[PDB]
Amino acid sequence: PKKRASNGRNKKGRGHVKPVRCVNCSKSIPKDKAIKRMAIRNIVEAAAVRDLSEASVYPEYALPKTYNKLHYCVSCAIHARIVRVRSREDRKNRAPP
Amino acid sequence: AVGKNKRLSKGKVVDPFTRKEWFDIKAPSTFENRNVGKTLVNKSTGLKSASDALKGRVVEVCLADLQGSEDHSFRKIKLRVDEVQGKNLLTNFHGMDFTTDKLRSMVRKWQTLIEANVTVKTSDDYVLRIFAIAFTRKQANQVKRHSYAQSSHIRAIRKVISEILTKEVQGSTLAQLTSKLIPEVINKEIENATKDIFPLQNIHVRKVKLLKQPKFDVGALMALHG
Amino acid sequence: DWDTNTIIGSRARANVARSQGQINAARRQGLVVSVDKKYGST
Amino acid sequence: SQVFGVARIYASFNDTFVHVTDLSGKETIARVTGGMKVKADRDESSPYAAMLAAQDVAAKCKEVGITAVHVKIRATGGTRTKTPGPGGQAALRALARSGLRIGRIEDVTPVPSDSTRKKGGRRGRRL
Amino acid sequence: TPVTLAKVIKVLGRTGSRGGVTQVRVEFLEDTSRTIVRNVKGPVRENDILVLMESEREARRL
Amino acid sequence: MRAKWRKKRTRRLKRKRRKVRARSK
RNA sequence: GGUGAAAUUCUUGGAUUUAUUGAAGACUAACUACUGCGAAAGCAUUUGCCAAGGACGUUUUCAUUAAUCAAGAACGAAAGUUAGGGGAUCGAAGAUGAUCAGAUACCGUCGUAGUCUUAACCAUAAACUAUGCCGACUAGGGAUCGGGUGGUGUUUUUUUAAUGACCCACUCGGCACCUUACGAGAAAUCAAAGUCUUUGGGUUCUGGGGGGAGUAUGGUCGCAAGGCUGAAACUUAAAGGAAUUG
Ligand SMILES: [Mg+2]
Ligand SMILES: [Mg+2]
Ligand SMILES: [Mg+2]
Ligand SMILES: [Mg+2]
Ligand SMILES: [Mg+2]
Ligand SMILES: [Mg+2]
Ligand SMILES: [Mg+2]
Ligand SMILES: [Mg+2]
Ligand SMILES: [Mg+2]
Ligand SMILES: [Mg+2]
Ligand SMILES: [Mg+2]
Ligand SMILES: [Mg+2]
Ligand SMILES: [Mg+2]
Ligand SMILES: [Mg+2]
Numbered sequence: 155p156k157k158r159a160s161n162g163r164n165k166k167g168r169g170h171v172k173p174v175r176c177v178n179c180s181k182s183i184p185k186d187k188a189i190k191r192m193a194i195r196n197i198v199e200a201a202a203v204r205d206l207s208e209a210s211v212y213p214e215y216a217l218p219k220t221y222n223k224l225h226y227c228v229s230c231a232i233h234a235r236i237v238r239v240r241s242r243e244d245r246k247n248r249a250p251p
Numbered sequence: 252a253v254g255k256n257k258r259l260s261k262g263k264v265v266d267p268f269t270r271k272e273w274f275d276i277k278a279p280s281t282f283e284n285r286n287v288g289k290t291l292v293n294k295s296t297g298l299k300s301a302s303d304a305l306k307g308r309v310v311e312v313c314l315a316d317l318q319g320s321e322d323h324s325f326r327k328i329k330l331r332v333d334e335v336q337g338k339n340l341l342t343n344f345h346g347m348d349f350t351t352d353k354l355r356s357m358v359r360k361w362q363t364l365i366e367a368n369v370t371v372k373t374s375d376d377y378v379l380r381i382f383a384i385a386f387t388r389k390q391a392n393q394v395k396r397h398s399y400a401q402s403s404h405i406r407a408i409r410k411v412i413s414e415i416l417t418k419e420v421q422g423s424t425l426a427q428l429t430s431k432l433i434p435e436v437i438n439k440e441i442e443n444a445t446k447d448i449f450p451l452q453n454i455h456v457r458k459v460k461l462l463k464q465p466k467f468d469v470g471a472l473m474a475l476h477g
Numbered sequence: 478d479w480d481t482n483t484i485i486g487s488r489a490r491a492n493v494a495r496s497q498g499q500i501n502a503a504r505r506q507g508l509v510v511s512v513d514k515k516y517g518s519t
Numbered sequence: 520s521q522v523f524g525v526a527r528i529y530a531s532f533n534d535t536f537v538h539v540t541d542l543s544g545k546e547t548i549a550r551v552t553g554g555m556k557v558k559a560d561r562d563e564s565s566p567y568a569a570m571l572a573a574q575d576v577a578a579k580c581k582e583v584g585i586t587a588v589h590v591k592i593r594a595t596g597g598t599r600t601k602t603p604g605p606g607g608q609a610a611l612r613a614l615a616r617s618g619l620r621i622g623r624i625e626d627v628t629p630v631p632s633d634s635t636r637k638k639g640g641r642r643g644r645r646l
Numbered sequence: 647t648p649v650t651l652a653k654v655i656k657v658l659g660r661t662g663s664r665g666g667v668t669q670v671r672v673e674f675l676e677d678t679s680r681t682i683v684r685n686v687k688g689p690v691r692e693n694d695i696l697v698l699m700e701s702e703r704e705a706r707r708l
Numbered sequence: 709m710r711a712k713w714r715k716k717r718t719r720r721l722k723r724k725r726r727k728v729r730a731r732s733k
Numbered sequence: 734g735g736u737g738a739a740a741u742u743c744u745u746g747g748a749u750u751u752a753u754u755g756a757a758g759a760c761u762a763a764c765u766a767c768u769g770c771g772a773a774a775g776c777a778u779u780u781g782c783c784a785a786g787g788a789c790g791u792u793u794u795c796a797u798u799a800a801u802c803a804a805g806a807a808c809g810a811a812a813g814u815u816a817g818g819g820g821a822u823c824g825a826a827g828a829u830g831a832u833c834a835g836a837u838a839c840c841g842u843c844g845u846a847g848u849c850u851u852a853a854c855c856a857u858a859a860a861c862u863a864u865g866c867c868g869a870c871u872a873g874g875g876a877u878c879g880g881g882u883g884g885u886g887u888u889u890u891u892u893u894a895a896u897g898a899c900c901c902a903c904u905c906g907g908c909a910c911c912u913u914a915c916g917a918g919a920a921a922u923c924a925a926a927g928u929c930u931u932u933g934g935g936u937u938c939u940g941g942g943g944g945g946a947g948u949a950u951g952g953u954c955g956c957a958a959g960g961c962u963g964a965a966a967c968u969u970a971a972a973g974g975a976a977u978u979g
Binding site for chain 6: 946947948949958959
């Protein structure tokens with residue numbers, strides 16, 4: 155039967171979506187079906203901040219960040235400890251934790 | 252993986268740093284700091300002419316280092332060597348850029364990105380490509396959560412920005428443009444001329460790149476140093 | 478988050494610089510917070 | 520008082536490159552990668568091989584005259600993985616202990632305006 | 647032959663598939679108040695003192 | 709069999725029968 | 734370099750890496766969303782030109798010109814065909830390294846046709862909302878897109894105007910969504926899959942157990958690949974849908 159109302163995706167009035175490639179396996183997945191995430195970390199790992207503070211030439215230096223947007227396919231997201239599987243009543247829950 | 256090269260030579264030790272010696276970099280006078288850093292070349296032999304070896308180098312430096320203040324922390328500046336005189340080589344402006352973290356911090360969703368570029372030539376026949384960026388902003392008292400523009404506001408904003416950038420360039424030779432970009436005064440009348448259309452936050456304009464240059468005219472560069 | 482950030486550098490404690498070399502050092506980079514008159518008389 | 524170079528850490532998978540060039544970048548000092556410190560062919564991108572390589576770049580920078588350095592971290596970029604390898608934070612940490620001075624950390628990963636095509640086919644890397 | 651002594655201050659948990667390796671964080675006696683995370687083969691308790699051939703290590707779970 | 713590869717198999721069979729019949733005609 | 738691990742491959746003729754340029758072709762990131770436009774397939778850089786379109790507003794005009802439609806017509810992803818151009822990537826075939834009992838597969842490295850464009854074909858798709866179009870009525874809730882109306886509402890310009898951008902209320906049209914089931918259904922579920930044994934709003938197309946079979950044959954279109962139309966002999970008592978417990 156029909157598992158989902160939107161069937162996998164966010165295509166309502168769109169016809170075509172012009173897909174993207176998964177960051178883990180280069181699988182072509184439509185952009186509405188993708189499981190887009192944003193990974194925003196510091197330029198420096200948290201165990202090196204005090205290390206880098208005493209080695210910096212500057213009194214006040216703002217640590218920059220990496221802002222990288224990730225697109226996963228369904229197979230790679232479930233395998234990589236992401237959205238993997240929810241119960242039928244919890245499938246309809248659209249709110250992030 | 253040392254023991255992995257099957258062959259090191261298809262057909263079948265002198266340390267170069269003793270040969271190497273140091274120079275120093277001089278910023279133009281439209282910058283609060285002249286001392287940028289030091290470079291290495293080989294010894295000036297009679298057949299390789301070390302002055303020509305370091306003649307066309309491009310040095311990457313930050314504007315916060317050039318001005319001391321940390322407010323212009325992103326704002327990267329290209330400096331191009333042109334004229335060398337006894338371990339005291341001089342540099343001229345080659346371009347300006349943003350850091351990748353500052354650009355990606357600005358680009359957020361549920362707002363509209365507006366980009367404008369021009370290809371206007373200055374008074375010294377410098378041809379520059381100047382890029383601009385802006386973002387629509389959520390006004391105070393606003394309830395709804397995205398604040399998008401209406402694609403004719405964008406075309407009205409883009410026309411306003413492109414006419415401003417092409418106006419401030421003709422009238423500025425090069426040093427007036429560098430002394431206009433440093434105070435970030437260009438971002439001001441973009442905001443003033445676009446507040447009629449849309450709120451438009453975050454107008455730290457964008458990079459500017461050089462395209463073509465005229466002849467040398469070494470009196471101009473010694474006006475920047477001397 | 479997008480808005481949060483951290484600051485590293487020399488200012489991640491203020492102390493009296495007894496040595497004049499420390500005074501010459503501290504003025505050189507530029508970390509001097511105050512110069513106060515001594516409590517006692519000369 | 521400080522002589523400044525550019526660190527240029529290529530933090531990929533399968534390898535890690537550290538080499539300190541001049542401010543202009545034309546003259547290069549102390550290029551030792553991670554593959555020349557471990558004999559596995561598997562852990563050329565490990566944090567150990569990265570930090571052993573970053574200890575060598577600072578030894579050859581101190582004996583040349585470099586005291587400080589700017590850091591440009593880098594992933595593979597282009598159409599490829601675009602995230603830093605495991606050796607990026609190890610190499611950056613290792614040359615901070617060694618005596619070098621750090622300023623202006625930055626990423627220089629080549630990010631396209633969605634260039635040509637990823638490899639692997641439209642069905643992916645099937646493993 | 648440089649060796650470095652470190653004191654276990656907080657035990658993080660077990661690691662390894664068979665469970666034989668313990669994640670601990672340690673405090674160095676010399677160069678006080680800078681701490682890293684290591685792995686211990688044997689039974690490690692609070693106020694155990696470790697000696698390390700190298701101190702340039704972070705601990706990743708096995 | 710997959711219905712795609714039975715469709716492929718009969719398409720190849722029709723091509724053989726089309727060309728073994730053009731011998732006579 | 735690649736990988737779970739390696740190997741093929743490139744390297745002291747300087748590989749990988751750094752800098753400065755140049756050339757080529759493709760693509761149009763981040764913004765980018767239960768958002769927009771189009772009959773659908775589809776369409777995401779700027780600007781100029783060309784012609785079109787929907788919704789809204791209207792105390793403008795015509796006056797039943799309408800709805801669905803055999804025959805017939807236009808458009809129609811990708812792949813494929815023909816002829817020029819282009820040919821950077823990726824890559825049906827092919828070549829190689831690995832794994833394997835085998836591996837002419839998955840994985841690695843190369844790599845033709847193709848991928849792009851121009852002129853002409855093809856006429857398919859899980860071409861899907863697996864849900865024909867037009868019309869009416871039936872339960873609540875907020876959001877949002879386009880237009881309009883009102884409000885001494887907030888902000889900015891030139892404190893101040895008009896505007897613009899927001900705020901509140903209303904309205905027409907649109908992509909949808911949340912709750913419930915009066916109602917439907919075999920159930921999954923459904924504001925239509927409701928107003929259907931208390932069975933008639935109008936109209937088009939299609940199906941009649943499973944195979945054999947979308948096969949044979951004959952037409953017809955197509956350069957071809959193929960598309961459209963399309964049986965019978967024979968065989969069979971189950972195939973199949975949705976839920977339950979293991
Ligand atoms: Mg199923
Ligand atoms: Mg479709
Ligand atoms: Mg080279
Ligand atoms: Mg774009
Ligand atoms: Mg839109
Ligand atoms: Mg069909
Ligand atoms: Mg159908
Ligand atoms: Mg109806
Ligand atoms: Mg409205
Ligand atoms: Mg509405
Ligand atoms: Mg809509
Ligand atoms: Mg029947
Ligand atoms: Mg039948
Ligand atoms: Mg079933």
